[PDB]
Amino acid sequence: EISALPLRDLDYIKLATDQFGCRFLQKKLETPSESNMVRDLMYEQIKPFFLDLILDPFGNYLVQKLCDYLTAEQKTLLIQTIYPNVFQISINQYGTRSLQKIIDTVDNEVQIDLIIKGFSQEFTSIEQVVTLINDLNGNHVIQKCIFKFSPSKFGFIIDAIVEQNNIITISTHKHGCCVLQKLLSVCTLQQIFKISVKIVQFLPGLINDQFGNYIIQFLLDIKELDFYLLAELFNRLSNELCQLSCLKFSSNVVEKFIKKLFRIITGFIASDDVINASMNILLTTIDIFTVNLNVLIRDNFGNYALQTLLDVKNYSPLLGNFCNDFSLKIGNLIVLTKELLPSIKTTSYAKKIKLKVKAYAEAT
RNA sequence: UGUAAUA
């Protein structure tokens, strides 16, 4: 029926929003002899409806398919048409597919810069950017930008994150937490810093959040942050370290934090200033865990923190002055655990603790 | 004995 019609006589808008018309057009695009011509005819007729098709249940398939065939000039004009609408497109079920494919097949920087302009405050508010980051459909467009574009383009993402308390809105959200991690994994160091300042400022709102705890831990894996983050975290948490060790989500961060102190000092046998404060903080921690040993060994979450501190496998090579202050105050904590060991017979993890006191002796 | 991620 439609196959018997000359391409020049096709009603491309009509076909584009139809499942079979759109599929017919796609197959025509995959047909080398007719690919170029069907593209150029289709293009001129559908260009006033670029936004419409991008959002269309079937049209979004055509737009995507077209991205593999459009000239640079054709794709540029397409982006010039719809860049102000990037918010609307990104939250859209079908629009998100179209935009990802467009972003994924940019030909040059002129096209990239247009998209970025769309995400700037001239067309998309900070609040809207935040919405996209947490949105079911939008977070995929943000991730696309994050993995396709140079970090020199990340301005609009950064601005939205550091705005007031948006670090909480983003970090404590199922989707935003993921995006932020993707961002941090590719960010420039100076961008990581700007976000880190905001994370530390709102640490209590993140440290024990179901998703926020993951952000803190992620930050702890970035080595270029050691020179300040270890002291910063601990100075903001020390007075409530026992509390945080006894909470579901923050207990993992304390464990992560403690293992990092061990890994840094052991590896010394990483820059020098870090080693200095790490030694100091570790000792203070043992003091804190010693004082509160009554609660930590008894807590449903705290015992994990304690066990991490006590595990000799973490600190074998530590067995100048510090290597003797540790051996004293951790050895002292070891014997103190023994005294309480009978007072927790009923618990499921007594034998796990008993093995650690046992493995202490074998290397002592 | 304890946490996440389109026909």
By the 8 A CB rule, do A269 and A260 touch? no
| Cα dist from A50 to A20, A63, A67, A83, A346, whole Å | 19, 8, 12, 11, 68
Residue in the block written with tokens 């270890």: A230
Q: What's the CA dihedral at A230, A235, A240, A243 to 10 degrees?
A: -10
The DSSP call for residue A179 is: H
Nucleotide nearest to A182 (CA to C1'): B5
Structure determined via:
X-ray
Whether residue A144 contacts residue A97, with contact meaning beta carbons closer than 8 Å, is answered with: no
Chain B nucleotides reached by a protein CB under 7 Å: 1-7
CA distance A329 to A249: 27
Supply the Cα-derived Rg of chain A in whole angstroms: 28
Strands, E assignment, chain A = none
Count of beta carbons in the 10 Å neighbourhood of residue A276: 12
Tell me the three state secondary structure of residue A154: coil
Instruction: Confirm whether any atom of chain B, the nucleic acid strand, is less than 7 Å from CB of A299.
Output: no
Q: Which two tokens stand for residue A99?
A: 């935009």
Residue A188, CB, strand B, below 7 Å? no
Contact partners, residue A362, CB within 8 Å, separation at least 6: none
Assigned token pair, A246: 């006894």
Q: Tell me the C-alpha distance between A47 and A301, whole Å.
A: 60
* Other beta carbons less than 10 A from residue A32's beta carbon: 7
Nucleotide in closest CA–C1' contact with A20: B7
Is the distance between the Cβ of A257 and the closest atom of strand B smaller than 7 Å? no
Per-residue b or e along A241-253, where b marks 16 or more CB atoms closer than 10 Å to that residue's CB: bbebbbbebbbbb
Picking from A315, A250, A258, A247, the residue whose alpha carbon sits closest to that of residue A285 is A258
Indicate yes or no: strand B within 7 A of the C-beta of A251.
yes
Query: Are the CB atoms for A305 and A258 separated by under 8 Å?
Result: yes
CA distance A312 to A291: 20
Structure token pair of residue A251: 């207990």
A349: CB partners within 8 A, 6+ apart: A303, A307
Cα(A84)–Cα(A220) distance, integer angstroms: 38
Q: Residues A78, A44: contact at Cβ < 8 Å?
A: no
State the amino acid at position A6 in one-letter form: P
Supply A133's token pair.
């980051």
Measure, in angstroms, how far nucleotide B3 C1' is from residue A120 CA. 35
A66 strand B contact, CB < 7 Å: no
Nearest CA among A148, A207, A199 for reference residue A170? A199
**Neighbouring residues of A185: CB distance < 8 A, sequence distance ≥ 6:** none
Non-local (6+) Cβ contacts of A293 within 8 A are A306, A333, A336, A337, A340
Using DSSP, state whether A342 is helix, strand or coil: helix
Rounded Cα–Cα distance for residues A332 and A343 (Å): 18
Q: Is A164 left (phi over 0), alpha (psi -120 to 50) or beta?
A: left
Inter-axis angle of helices A95-104 and A72-82, nearest 10: 140
Structure tokens at A359: 């493995």
The answer to whether some atom of strand B lies closer than 7 Å to the beta carbon of A22 is: yes
**CATH numbers and ranges of domains, chain A:** 1-364 (1.25.10.10)
Residue A169 (CA) to nucleotide B3 (C1'), in angstroms, measures 19
Nucleotide whose C1' lies closest to the alpha carbon of residue A353 = B1
At A101, the amino acid letter reads K
Tokens of A240: 């409530």
DSSP-assigned letters across all residues of A182-237? HHHHHS-HHHHHHHHHHHHHTGGGTTTSTTHHHHHHHHTT-GGGHHHHHHHHHHHH
Query: How far does CA A316 lie from the centroid of its chain?
Result: 33
Which residues fall within 8 angstroms of residue A98, CB to CB, at 6 or more apart?
Answer: A53, A54, A55, A60, A63, A64, A89
The backbone torsions φ and ψ at residue A25, rounded to the nearest 5 degrees and listed phi first, read: -65, -40
Residues 6+ apart with CB under 8 A from A221: none
